[PDB]
Coordinates of C-alpha atoms in Angstrom, one line a residue:
Chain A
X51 CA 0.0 0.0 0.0
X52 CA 1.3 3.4 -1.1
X53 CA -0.7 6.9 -0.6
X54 CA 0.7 10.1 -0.2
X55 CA -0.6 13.4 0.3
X56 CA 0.4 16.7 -1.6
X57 CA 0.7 20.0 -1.6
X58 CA 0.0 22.0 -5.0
X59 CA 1.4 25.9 -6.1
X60 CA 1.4 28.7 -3.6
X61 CA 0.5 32.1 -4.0
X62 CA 1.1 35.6 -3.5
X63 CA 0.5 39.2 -3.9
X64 CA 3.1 42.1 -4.7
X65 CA 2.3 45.3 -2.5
X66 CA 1.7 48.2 -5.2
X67 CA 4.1 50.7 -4.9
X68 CA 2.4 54.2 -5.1
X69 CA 5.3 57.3 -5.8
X70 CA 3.0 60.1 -4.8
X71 CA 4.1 62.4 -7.8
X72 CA 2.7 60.0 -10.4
X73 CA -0.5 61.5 -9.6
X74 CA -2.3 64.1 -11.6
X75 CA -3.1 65.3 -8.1
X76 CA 0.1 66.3 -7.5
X77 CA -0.3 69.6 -9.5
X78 CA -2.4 70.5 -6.5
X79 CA 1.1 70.4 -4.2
X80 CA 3.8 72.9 -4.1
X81 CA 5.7 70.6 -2.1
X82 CA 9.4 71.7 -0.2
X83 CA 10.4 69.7 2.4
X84 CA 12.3 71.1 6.0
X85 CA 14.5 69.4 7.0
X86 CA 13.9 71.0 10.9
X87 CA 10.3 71.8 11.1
X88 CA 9.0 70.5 14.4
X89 CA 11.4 73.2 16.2
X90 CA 9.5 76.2 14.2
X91 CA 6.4 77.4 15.7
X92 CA 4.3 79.6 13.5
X93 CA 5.3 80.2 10.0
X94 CA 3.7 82.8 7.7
X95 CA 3.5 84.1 3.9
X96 CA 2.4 87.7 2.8
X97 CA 0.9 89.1 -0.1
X98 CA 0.0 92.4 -1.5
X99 CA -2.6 93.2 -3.8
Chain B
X3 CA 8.7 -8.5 -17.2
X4 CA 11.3 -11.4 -17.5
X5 CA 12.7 -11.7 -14.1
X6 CA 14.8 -14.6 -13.2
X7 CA 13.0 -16.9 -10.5
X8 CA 12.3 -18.7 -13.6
X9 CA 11.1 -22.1 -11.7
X10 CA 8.0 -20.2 -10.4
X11 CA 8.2 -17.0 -12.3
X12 CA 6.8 -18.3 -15.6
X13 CA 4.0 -20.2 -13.7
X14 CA 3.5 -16.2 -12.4
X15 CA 2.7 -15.1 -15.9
X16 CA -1.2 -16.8 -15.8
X23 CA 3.7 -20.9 -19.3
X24 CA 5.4 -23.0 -21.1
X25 CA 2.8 -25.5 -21.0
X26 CA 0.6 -23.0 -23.3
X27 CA 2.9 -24.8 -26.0
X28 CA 2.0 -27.8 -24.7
X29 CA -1.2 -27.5 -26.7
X30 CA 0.4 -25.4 -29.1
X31 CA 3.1 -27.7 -30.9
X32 CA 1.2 -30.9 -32.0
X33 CA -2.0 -28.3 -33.0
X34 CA -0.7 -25.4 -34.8
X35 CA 3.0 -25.7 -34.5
X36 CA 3.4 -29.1 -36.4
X37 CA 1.9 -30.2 -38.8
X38 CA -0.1 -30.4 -42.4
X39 CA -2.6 -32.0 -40.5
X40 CA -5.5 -31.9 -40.3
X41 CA -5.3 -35.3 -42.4
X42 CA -3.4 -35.8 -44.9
X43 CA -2.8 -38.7 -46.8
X44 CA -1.6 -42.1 -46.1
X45 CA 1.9 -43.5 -45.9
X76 CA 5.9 17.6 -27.3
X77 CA 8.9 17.1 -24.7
X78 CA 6.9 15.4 -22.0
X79 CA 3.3 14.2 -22.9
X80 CA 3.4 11.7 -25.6
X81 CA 5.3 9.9 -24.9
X82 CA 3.1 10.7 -21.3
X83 CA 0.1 10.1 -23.2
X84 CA 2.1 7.8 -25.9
X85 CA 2.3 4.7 -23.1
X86 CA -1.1 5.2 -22.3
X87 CA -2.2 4.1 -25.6
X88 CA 0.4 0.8 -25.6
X89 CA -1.2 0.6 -22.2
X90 CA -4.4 -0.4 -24.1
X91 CA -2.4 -2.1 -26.8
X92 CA -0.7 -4.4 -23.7
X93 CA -4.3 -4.9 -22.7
X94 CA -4.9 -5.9 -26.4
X95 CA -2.3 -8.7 -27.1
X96 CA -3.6 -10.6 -24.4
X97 CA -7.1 -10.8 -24.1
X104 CA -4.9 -16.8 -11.7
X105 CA -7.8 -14.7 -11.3
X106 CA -10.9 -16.1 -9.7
X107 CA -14.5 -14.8 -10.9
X108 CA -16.4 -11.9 -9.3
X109 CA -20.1 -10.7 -9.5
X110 CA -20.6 -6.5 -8.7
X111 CA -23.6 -5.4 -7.8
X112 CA -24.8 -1.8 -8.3
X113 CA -27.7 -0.1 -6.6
X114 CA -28.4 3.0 -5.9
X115 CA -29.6 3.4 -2.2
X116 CA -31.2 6.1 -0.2
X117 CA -29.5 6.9 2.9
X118 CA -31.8 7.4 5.7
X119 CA -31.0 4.2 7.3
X120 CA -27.8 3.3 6.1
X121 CA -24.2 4.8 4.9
X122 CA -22.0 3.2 2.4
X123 CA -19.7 6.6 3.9
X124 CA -18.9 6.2 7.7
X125 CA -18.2 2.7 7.1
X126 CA -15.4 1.9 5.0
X127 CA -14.9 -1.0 2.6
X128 CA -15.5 -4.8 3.9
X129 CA -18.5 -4.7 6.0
X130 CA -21.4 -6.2 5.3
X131 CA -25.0 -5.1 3.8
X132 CA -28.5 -6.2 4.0
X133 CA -31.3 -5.5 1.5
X134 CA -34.6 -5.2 2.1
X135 CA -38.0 -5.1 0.2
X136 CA -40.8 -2.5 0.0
X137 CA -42.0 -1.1 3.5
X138 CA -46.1 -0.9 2.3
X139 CA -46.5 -4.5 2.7
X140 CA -45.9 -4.2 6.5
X141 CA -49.1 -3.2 7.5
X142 CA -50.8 -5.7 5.4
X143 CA -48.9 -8.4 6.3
X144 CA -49.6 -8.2 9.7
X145 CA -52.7 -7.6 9.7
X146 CA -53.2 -11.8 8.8
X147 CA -50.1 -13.4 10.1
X148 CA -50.4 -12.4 13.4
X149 CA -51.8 -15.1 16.0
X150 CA -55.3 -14.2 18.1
X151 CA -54.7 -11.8 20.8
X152 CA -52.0 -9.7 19.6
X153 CA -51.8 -5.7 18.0
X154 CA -52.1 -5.8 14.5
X155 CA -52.4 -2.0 14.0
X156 CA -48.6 -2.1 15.8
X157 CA -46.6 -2.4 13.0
X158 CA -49.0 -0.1 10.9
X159 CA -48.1 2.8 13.0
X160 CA -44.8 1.9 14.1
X161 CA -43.7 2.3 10.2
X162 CA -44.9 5.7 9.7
X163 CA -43.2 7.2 12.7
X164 CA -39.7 5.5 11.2
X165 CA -40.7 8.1 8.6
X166 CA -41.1 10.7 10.0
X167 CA -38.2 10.5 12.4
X168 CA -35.8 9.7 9.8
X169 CA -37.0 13.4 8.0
X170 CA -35.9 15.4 10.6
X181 CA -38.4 2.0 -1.3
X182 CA -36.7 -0.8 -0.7
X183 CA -33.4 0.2 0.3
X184 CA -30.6 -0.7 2.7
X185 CA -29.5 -1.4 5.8
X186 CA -25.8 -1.8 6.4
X187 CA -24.8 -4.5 9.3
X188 CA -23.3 -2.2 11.8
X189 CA -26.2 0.3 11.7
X190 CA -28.4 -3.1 12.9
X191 CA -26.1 -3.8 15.8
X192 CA -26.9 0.0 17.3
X193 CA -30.5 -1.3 17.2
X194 CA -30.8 -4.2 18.6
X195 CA -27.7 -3.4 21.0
X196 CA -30.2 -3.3 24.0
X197 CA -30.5 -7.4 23.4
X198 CA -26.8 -8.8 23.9
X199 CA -24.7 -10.3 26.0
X200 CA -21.8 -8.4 25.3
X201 CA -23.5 -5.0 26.0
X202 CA -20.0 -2.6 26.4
X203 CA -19.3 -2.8 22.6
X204 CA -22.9 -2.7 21.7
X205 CA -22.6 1.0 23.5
X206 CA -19.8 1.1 21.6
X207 CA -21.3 0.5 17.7
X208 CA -24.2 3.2 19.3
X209 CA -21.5 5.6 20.6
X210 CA -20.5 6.4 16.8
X211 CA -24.1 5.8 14.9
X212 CA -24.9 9.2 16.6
X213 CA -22.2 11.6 15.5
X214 CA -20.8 9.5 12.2
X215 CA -23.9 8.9 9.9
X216 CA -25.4 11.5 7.8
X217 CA -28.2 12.8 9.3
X218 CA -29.5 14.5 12.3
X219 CA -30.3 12.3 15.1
X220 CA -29.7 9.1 14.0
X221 CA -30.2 7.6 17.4
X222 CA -33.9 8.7 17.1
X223 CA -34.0 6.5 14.5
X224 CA -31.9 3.7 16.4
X225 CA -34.8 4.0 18.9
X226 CA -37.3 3.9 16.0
X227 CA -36.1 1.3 13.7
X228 CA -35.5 -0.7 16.4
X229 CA -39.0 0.0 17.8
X230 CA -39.8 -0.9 14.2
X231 CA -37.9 -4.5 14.8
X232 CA -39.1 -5.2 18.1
X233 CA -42.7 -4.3 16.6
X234 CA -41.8 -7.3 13.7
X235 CA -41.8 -10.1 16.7
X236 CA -44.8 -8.8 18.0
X237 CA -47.0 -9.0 14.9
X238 CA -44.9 -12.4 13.8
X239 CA -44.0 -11.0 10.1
X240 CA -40.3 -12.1 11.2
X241 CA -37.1 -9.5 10.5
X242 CA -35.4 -12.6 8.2
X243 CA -38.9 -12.2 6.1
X244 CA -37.4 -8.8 5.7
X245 CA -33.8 -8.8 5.5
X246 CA -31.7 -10.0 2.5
X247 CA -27.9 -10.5 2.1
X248 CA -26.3 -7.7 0.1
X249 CA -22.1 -8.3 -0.4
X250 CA -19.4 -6.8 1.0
X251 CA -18.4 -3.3 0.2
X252 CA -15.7 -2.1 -2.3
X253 CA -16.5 1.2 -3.3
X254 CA -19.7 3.7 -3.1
X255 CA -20.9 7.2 -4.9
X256 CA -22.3 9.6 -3.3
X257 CA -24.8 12.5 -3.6
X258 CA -27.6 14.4 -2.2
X259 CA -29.5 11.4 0.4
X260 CA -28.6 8.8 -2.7
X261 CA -25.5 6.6 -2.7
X262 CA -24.4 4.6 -5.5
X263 CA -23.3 1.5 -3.8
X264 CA -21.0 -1.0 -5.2
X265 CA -20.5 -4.7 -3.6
X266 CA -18.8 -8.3 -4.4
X267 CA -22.8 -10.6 -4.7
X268 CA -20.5 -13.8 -5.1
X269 CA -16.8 -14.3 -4.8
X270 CA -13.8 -13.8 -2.8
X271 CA -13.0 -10.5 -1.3
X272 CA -9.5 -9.6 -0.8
X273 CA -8.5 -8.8 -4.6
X274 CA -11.9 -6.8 -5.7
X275 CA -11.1 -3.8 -7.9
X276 CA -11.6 -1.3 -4.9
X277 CA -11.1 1.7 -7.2
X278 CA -7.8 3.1 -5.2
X279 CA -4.4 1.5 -7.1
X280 CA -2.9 2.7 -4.3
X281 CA -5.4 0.3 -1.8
X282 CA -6.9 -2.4 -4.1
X283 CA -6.7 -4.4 -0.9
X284 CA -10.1 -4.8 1.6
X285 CA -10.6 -6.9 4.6
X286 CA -13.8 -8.0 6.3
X287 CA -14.8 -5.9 9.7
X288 CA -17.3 -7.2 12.1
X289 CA -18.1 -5.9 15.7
X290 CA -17.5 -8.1 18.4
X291 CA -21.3 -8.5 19.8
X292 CA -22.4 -10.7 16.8
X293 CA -19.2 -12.8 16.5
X294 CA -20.3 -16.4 17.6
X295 CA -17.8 -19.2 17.7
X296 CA -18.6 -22.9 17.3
X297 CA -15.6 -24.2 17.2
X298 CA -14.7 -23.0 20.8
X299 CA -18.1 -24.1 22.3
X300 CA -18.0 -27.0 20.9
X301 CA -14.6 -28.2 21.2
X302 CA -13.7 -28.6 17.2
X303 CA -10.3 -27.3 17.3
X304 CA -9.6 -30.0 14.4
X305 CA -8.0 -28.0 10.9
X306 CA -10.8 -27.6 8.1
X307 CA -12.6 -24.8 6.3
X308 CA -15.0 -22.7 8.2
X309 CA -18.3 -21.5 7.1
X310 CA -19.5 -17.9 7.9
X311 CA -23.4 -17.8 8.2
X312 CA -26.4 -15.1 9.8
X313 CA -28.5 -16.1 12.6
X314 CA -31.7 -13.8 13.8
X315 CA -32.9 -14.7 17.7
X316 CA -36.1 -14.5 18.5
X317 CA -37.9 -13.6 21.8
X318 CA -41.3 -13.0 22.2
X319 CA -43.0 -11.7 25.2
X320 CA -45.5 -9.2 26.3
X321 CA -44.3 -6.2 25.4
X322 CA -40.9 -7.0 25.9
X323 CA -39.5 -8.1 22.7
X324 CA -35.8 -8.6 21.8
X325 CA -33.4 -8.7 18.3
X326 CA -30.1 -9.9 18.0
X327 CA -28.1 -10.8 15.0
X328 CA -25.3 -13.1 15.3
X329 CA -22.6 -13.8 12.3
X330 CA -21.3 -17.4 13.1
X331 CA -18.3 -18.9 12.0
X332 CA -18.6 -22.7 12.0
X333 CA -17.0 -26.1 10.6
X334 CA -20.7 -27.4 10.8
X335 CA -22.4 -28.1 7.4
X336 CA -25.6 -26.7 7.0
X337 CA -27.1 -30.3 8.1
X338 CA -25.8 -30.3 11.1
X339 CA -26.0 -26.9 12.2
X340 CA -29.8 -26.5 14.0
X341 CA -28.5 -29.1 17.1
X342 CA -26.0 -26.5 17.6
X343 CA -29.2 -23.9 17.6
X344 CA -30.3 -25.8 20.0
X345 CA -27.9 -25.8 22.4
X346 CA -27.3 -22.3 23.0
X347 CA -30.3 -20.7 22.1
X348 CA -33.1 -22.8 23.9
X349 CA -33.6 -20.5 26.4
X350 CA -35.0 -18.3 23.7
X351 CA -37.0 -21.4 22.9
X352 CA -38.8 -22.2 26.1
X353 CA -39.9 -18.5 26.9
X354 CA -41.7 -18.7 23.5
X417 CA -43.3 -21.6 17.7
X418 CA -39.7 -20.7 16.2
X419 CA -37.0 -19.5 17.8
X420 CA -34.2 -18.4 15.4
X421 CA -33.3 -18.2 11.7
X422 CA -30.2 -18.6 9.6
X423 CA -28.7 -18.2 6.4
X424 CA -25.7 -19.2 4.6
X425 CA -23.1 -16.2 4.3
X426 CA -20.2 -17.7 2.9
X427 CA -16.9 -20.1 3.2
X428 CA -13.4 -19.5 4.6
X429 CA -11.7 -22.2 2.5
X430 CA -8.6 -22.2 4.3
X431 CA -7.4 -25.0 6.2
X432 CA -6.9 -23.3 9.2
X433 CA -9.3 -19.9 9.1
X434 CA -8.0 -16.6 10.3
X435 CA -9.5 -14.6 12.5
X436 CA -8.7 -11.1 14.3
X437 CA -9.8 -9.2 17.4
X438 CA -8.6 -5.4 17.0
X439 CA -10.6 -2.2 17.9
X440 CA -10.6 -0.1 14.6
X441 CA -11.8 3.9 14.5
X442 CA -14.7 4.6 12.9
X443 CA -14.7 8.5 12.8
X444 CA -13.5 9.0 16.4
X445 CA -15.0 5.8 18.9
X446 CA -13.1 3.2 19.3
X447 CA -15.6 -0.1 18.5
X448 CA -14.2 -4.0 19.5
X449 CA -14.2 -5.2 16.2
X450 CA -13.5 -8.9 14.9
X451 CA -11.6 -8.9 11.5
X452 CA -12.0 -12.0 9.2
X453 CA -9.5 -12.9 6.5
X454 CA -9.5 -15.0 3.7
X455 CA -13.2 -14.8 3.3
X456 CA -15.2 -16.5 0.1
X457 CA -18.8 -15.2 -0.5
X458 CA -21.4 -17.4 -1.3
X459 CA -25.1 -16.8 0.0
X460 CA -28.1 -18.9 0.4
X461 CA -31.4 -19.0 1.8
X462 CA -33.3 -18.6 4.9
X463 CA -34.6 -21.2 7.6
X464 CA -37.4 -21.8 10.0
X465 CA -37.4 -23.5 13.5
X466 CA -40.7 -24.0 15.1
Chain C
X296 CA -12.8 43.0 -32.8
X297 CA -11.6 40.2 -34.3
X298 CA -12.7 36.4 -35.9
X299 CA -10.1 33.9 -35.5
X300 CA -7.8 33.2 -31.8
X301 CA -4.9 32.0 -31.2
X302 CA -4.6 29.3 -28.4
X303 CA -2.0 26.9 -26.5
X304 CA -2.2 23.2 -27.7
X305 CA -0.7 20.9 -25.6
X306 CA -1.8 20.7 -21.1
X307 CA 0.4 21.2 -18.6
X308 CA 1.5 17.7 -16.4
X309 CA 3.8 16.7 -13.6
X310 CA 5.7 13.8 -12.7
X311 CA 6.8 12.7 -9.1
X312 CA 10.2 11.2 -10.8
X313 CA 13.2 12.9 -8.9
X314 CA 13.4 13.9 -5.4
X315 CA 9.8 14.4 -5.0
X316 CA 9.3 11.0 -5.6
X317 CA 11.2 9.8 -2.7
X318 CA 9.4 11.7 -0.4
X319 CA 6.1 10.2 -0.9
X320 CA 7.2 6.6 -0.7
X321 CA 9.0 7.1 2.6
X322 CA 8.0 10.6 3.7
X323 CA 4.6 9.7 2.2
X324 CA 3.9 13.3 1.4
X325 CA 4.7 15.1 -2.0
X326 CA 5.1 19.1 -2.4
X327 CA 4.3 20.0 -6.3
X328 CA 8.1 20.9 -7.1
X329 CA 9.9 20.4 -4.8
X330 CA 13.1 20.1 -6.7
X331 CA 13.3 24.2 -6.4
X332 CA 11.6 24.7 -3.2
X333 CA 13.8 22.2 -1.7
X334 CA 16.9 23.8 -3.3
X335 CA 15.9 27.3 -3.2
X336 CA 15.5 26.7 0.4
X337 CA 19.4 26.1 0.4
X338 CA 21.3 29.0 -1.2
X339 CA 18.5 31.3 0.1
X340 CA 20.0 30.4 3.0
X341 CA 22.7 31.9 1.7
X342 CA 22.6 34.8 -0.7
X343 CA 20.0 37.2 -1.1
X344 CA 17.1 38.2 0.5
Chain D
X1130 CA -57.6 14.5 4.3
X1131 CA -54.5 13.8 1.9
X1132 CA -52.4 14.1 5.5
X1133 CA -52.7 12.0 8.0
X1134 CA -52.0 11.6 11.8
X1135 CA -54.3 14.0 12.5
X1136 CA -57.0 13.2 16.0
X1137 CA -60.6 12.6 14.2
X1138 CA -63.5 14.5 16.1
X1139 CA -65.3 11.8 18.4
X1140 CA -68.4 10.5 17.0
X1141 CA -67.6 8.8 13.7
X1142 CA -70.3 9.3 11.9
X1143 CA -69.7 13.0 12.1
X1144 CA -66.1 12.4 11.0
X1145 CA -67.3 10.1 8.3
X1146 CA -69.5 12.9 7.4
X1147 CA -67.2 15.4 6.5
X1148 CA -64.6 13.3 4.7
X1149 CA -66.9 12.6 2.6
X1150 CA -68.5 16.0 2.4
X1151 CA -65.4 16.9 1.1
X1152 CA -62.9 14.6 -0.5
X1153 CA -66.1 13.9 -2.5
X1154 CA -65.7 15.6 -6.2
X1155 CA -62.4 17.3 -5.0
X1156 CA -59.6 18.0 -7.6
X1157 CA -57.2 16.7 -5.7
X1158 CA -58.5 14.6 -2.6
X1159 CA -57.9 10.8 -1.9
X1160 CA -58.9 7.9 -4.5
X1161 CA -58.5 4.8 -2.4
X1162 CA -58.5 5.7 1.6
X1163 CA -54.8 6.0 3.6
X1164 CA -52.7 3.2 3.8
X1165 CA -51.7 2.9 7.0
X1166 CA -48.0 2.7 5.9
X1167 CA -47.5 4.8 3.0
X1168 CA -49.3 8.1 1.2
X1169 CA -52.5 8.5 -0.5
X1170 CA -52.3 8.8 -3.5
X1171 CA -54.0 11.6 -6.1
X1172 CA -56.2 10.9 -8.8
X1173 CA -54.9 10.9 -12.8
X1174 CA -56.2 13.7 -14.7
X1175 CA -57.6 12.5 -17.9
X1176 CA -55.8 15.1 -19.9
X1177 CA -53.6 17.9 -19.1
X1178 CA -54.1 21.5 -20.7

């Protein structure tokens, strides 16, 4: 007597990997990075019209 | 394939003495009279079709007859049990209450079996079918002498066979058999021999059963290649010696055979079914009845009935006495080997 | 679109012959190739991750 | 009246007398009374439509 039992394939997934500046939403961003922020307190930006 | 034990190995190929008729036939001579004075499959495939041709260049193996039927499985599974237990036909359940109605003698309930049918029905939904033999021990377990392993065959009726409570119909169907001694339409009336199992199909409350009618049992195509190998399985409450209780411990071949009990009282009816292995021919085989089951026979004008169930033709027979799993209870169960079927019929005893 | 397709011939198959036979007649268990898992599960411990 | 296994009312004659006031003519009603085993069975339409 011979009988076995098997195992067949295995599967998985690839996490996508999602660069943010593919999107067409990025035109919505001006986007510059500090490298110390979380030592300034307020900042501020001025116009005139 | 040409191995070299060639003293026995030839006689393994059924020989040599196929030319024994061969040569003075069709080897020699003018006579009749005369005068006076693509990488892997195919060849994967390739084989299987010289597979058939192998099959085709030639056409021991002893005979078989399969049997087929396709069985409804309130009462019985071809699926707890596994292959090499033993089955039991029956006939069609609307004779019952007719049958009793006539047979029965003066001063008994001949509406009893009427009733007691129709309740099997509708117990068994919360035709003549099948009954498999260790479902019948569960029933009539409340009747033996060796009670523990009756328990035992009930302990995994409940919780193995399809169906919701299965032990209601334990206490039904065998309400229905302790109803058949009442009204004296007797349960071997009822029950015929179906063979031993080798494979079954199943579906939706039908099974497609498959079993040996006539023949031996250990070399039945069983389906699996891997396990084309079956043994018989009995449980220990039914397994009567006569050998042992009657001393024959001389060498011979023993003969298997079913044997109902009867007992009728007043409203306290027994059943038992007993598989006996004996070296008695069938002659002299009701002075062994006699012996051990007269007590049956003064507190009752029958008192058993028997059946031929096959032949062990081995010189000394083979028995076992191992306790097998059946889903997850361990039942006492008495293994026979080297077992021939051949059936026969029934018997009466008054 | 389009009328006529084109379409693979032959089925796919596999064979215990090799290690993965072995297995199942001792072992008695068979993985589906094994012959990669089994190796790959020797210079992996190794080389990359 | 098809079913069965239901108490009859006491006095038979009054049972007797509905059954029949009933199953008499009906579509669909009993030919030949219960068996006590098995069902009843339903009369064969001539022709179906």
């Amino acid at each position: 007597d011979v009988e076995f039992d098997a195992l067949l394939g295995s599967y998985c997934n690839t996490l996508s990997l999602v660069r943010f500046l593919e999107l067409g939403l990025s035109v919505a961003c001006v986007c510059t990075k500090f490298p110390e922020l979380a030592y300034m307190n307020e900042g501020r930006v001025q116009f005139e019209v | 394939t040409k191995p070299l034990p060639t003293a026995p190995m030839a006689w393994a190929e059924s020989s040599p003495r196929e030319l024994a008729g061969h040569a003075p036939l069709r080897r020699v001579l003018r006579p009749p009279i005369a005068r006076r004075d693509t990488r892997a499959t195919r060849d994967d495939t390739e084989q299987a079709v010289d597979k058939i041709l192998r099959g085709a260049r030639r056409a021991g193996a002893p005979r078989y007859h399969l049997t087929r039927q396709v069985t409804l499985t309130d009462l019985c599974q071809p699926n707890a049990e596994r292959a090499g237990a033993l089955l039991l036909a029956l006939r069609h359940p609307t004779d019952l209450p007719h049958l009793a109605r006539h047979r029965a003698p003066p001063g008994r309930q001949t509406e009893r079996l009427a009733e007691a049918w129709g309740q099997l029905l509708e117990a068994s939904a919360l035709r003549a079918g099948l009954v498999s033999f260790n479902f019948l021990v569960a029933a009539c377990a409340a009747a033996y002498d060796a009670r523990d392993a009756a328990e035992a065959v009930r302990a995994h009726i409940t919780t193995n066979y399809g169906g919701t409570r299965a032990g209601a119909r334990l206490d039904r169907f065998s309400e229905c058999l302790r109803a058949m001694v009442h009204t004296h339409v007797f349960p071997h009336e009822v029950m015929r021999f179906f063979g031993g199992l080798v494979s079954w199909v199943t579906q939706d409350e039908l099974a497609s059963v498959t079993a040996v009618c006539s023949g031996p049992q250990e070399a039945t195509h069983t389906g699996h290649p891997g396990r084309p190998r079956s043994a018989v399985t009995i449980p220990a409450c039914a397994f009567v010696d006569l050998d042992a209780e009657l001393c024959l411990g001389g060498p011979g071949a023993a003969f298997l055979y079913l044997v109902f009990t009867y007992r009728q009282c007043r409203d306290q009816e027994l059943c038992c079914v007993y598989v006996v292995k004996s070296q008695l021919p069938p002659r002299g085989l009701e002075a062994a009845l006699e012996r051990l089951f007269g007590r049956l026979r003064i507190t009752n004008c029958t008192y058993a009935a028997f059946a031929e169930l096959g032949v062990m033709p081995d010189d000394s027979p083979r028995c076992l006495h191992r306790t097998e799993r059946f889903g997850a209870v361990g039942v006492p169960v008495v293994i026979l080997e080297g077992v021939v079927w051949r059936p026969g019929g029934w018997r009466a005893c008054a | 679109e389009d009328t006529e397709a084109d379409v693979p011939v032959t089925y796919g198959e596999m064979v215990l012959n090799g290690a993965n036979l072995v297995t199942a007649l001792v072992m008695g268990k068979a993985v589906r190739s094994l012959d990669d898992v089994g190796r790959h599960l020797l210079e992996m411990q190794e080389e990359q991750l | 009246y098809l079913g069965r296994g239901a108490p009859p009312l006491l006095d038979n004659a009054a049972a007797v007398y509905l059954r029949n006031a009933v199953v008499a003519g009906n579509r669909l009603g009993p030919a030949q009374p219960l068996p006590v085993f098995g069902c009843a069975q339903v009369p064969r339409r001539a022709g179906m439509d």
